[PDB]
A paper describes a structure:
Classical Zn2+-dependent deac(et)ylases play fundamental regulatory roles in life and are well characterized in eukaryotes regarding their structures, substrates and physiological roles. All active site residues were conserved, as shown by the multiple sequence alignment and the structural alignment, suggesting a general acid/base catalytic mechanism for the bacterial enzymes as described for the eukaryotic counterparts. These enzymes mediate catalysis using a penta-coordinated catalytic Zn2+ ion coordinated by two aspartates and a histidine (KpHdaH (1b): Asp181, Asp269, His183).
We were able to solve two crystal structure for two Legionella enzymes of cluster 3, L. cherrii ApaH and L. pneumophila ApaH. These features might be needed for recognition of the enzymes by the type IV secretion system for secretion into the host cell, or important for interaction with other proteins such as the methyltransferase RomA or the lysine acetyltransferase KAT7 in the host cells, which calls for further investigations. To this end, differences in the sequences in the region of the RPP-motif might explain the observed highest activity as deacetylase while also being active as depropionylase and de-d/l-lactylase. LcApaH converts the lactylated peptides LGKd-la and LGKl-la with comparable catalytic efficiency for the two stereoisomers (kcat/KM (Kl-la): 0.03 × 103 M−1 s−1 and kcat/KM (Kd-la): 0.04 × 103 M−1 s−1) but more than three orders of magnitude less efficient than its deacylation of LGKac (kcat/KM (Kac): 139 × 103 M−1 s−1). The structures show an open active site entry due to absence of oligomer formation and, as a consequence, the missing in trans supply of the active site lid as observed for cluster 1 and cluster 4 enzymes. Notably, for the cluster 3 enzymes LpApaH and LcApaH we discovered the highest discrepancy in the inhibitory potency between SAHA and TSA, with TSA inhibiting the enzymes almost 80–95-fold stronger.
Author numbering: 21 to 409
């Protein structure tokens, strides 16, 4: 076939010691164990096309910068970085989303972290000397070494803002990509399905204040009683506009070309034996938004900043710590997603592909949350039984 499973390389993961994740693992131990499970279903089936971030090949000024960062001087790295050519593709696609000054701060931060080997800035972000480089490799590897349909395991993105990171997210790779795709191609129909139990609030901010010119449909499934603890009255406040009831306690907002759908896991609950209506929506909306793109002779681009911390078998506080308790068995059914939902979700999407493979530009699946080792080492295989076929 034609997919690609990007993973961070071993030298890369070895710079993520100490970076916060949602449980007892740090992002090192997490991504170590996940690439292990992919090394499992890759010796089960050497067709699973896994590539590390090391087959990425960067321009000499970038590698020069990383090398200069190691020599410990902030001023030389910055003047060096400042002297990058403004038409370098990487730089061009970063500045489409982030500020230069945030970038420089990540460079200052990486060098300052050289003192004790890490820099804790806010209890949700930890920076290491390697951290800038490993993210550049992660993003570049996806931007140019992409190819249609692409699974990237790597740091989280959706809580990262234009001039700052939060909730484990340093850089918003999902937005850098999307901006990059509309860069010089005919106007696309951008469709986003962010299944992380937490809210795609950084992404949405970035999309809302810079991409109000493109056709985006951001379907955001999240539980408002967990981080970032923002509800429909909040989102009514951002968009300066009351939400439009799309049925089933689901509300859409519009900021120009952006149309943001809050499928609230707590307002929108599973009817008894059924599949969770959240995914059910995503598939219906999607299928609709594709036909709309065929009608307007326009192409589509799909993005899945998905986390598994919305699976019913997560244990992490950002998934199960709601309203003062941990969700019991029963409540886990009606508000969290199960393997049958996911096997329905992904099986659906992949099925939609071959009916409109022409009318696709590229699809991208980006790991976000997911923290219980048992739960993710299994959903990973579930994805790999499905990416296989
Ligand atoms: K979080
Ligand atoms: K979400
Ligand atoms: Zn999450």
């Amino acid at each position: 076939p034609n997919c690609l499973i990007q993973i961070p390389s071993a030298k890369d993961i070895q710079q993520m010691h100490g970076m916060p994740a949602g449980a007892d693992e740090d992002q090192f131990e997490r991504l170590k164990h996940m690439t292990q499970v992919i090394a499992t279903t890759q010796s089960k089936d050497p067709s699973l096309p896994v590539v590390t971030t090391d087959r990425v090949e960067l321009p000499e000024h970038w590698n020069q910068l990383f090398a200069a960062m190691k020599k410990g001087d902030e001023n030389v790295a910055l003047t060096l970085f400042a002297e990058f050519p403004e038409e370098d593709q990487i730089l061009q696609a970063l500045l489409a989303v982030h500020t230069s000054e945030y970038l420089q701060q990540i460079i200052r931060d990486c060098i300052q972290a050289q003192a004790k080997g890490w820099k804790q800035l806010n209890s949700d972000i930890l920076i290491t000397p390697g951290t800038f480089e490993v993210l550049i490799k992660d993003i570049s590897m996806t931007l140019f070494h992409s190819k249609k349909v692409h699974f990237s395991f790597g740091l989280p993105t959706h809580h990262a803002f234009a001039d700052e990171g939060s909730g484990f997210c340093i850089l918003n790779k999902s937005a850098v990509l999307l901006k990059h795709m509309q860069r010089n191609t005919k106007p696309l129909k951008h469709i986003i399905v962010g299944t992380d139990v937490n809210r795609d609030n950084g992404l949405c901010d970035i999309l809302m204040n810079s991409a109000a010119d493109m056709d985006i449909c951001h379907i955001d499934v999240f539980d408002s009683r967990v981080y970032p603890y923002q509800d429909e009255d909040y989102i009514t406040e951002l968009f300066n506009k009351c939400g439009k009831d799309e049925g089933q306690n689901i509300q859409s907002w519009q900021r120009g070309g952006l149309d943001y759908f809050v499928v609230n896991l707590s307002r929108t609950t599973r009817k008894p034996g059924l599949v969770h209506p959240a995914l059910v929506f995503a598939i219906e909306k999607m299928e609709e938004q594709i036909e709309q793109a065929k009608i307007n002779h326009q192409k589509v681009a799909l993005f899945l900043p998905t986390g598994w911390d919305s699976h019913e078998e997560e244990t992490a506080y950002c998934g199960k710590y709601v309203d003062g308790y941990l969700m019991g068995a029963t409540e886990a059914r009606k508000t969290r997603l199960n393997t049958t939902d996911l096997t329905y979700f992904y099986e659906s999407i992949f099925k939609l592909y071959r009916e409109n493979k022409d009318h696709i530009e590229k699809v991208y699946w980006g790991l976000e949350g997911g923290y219980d080792r048992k739960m993710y080492e299994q959903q990973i295989e579930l994805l790999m039984s499905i990416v296989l076929n």
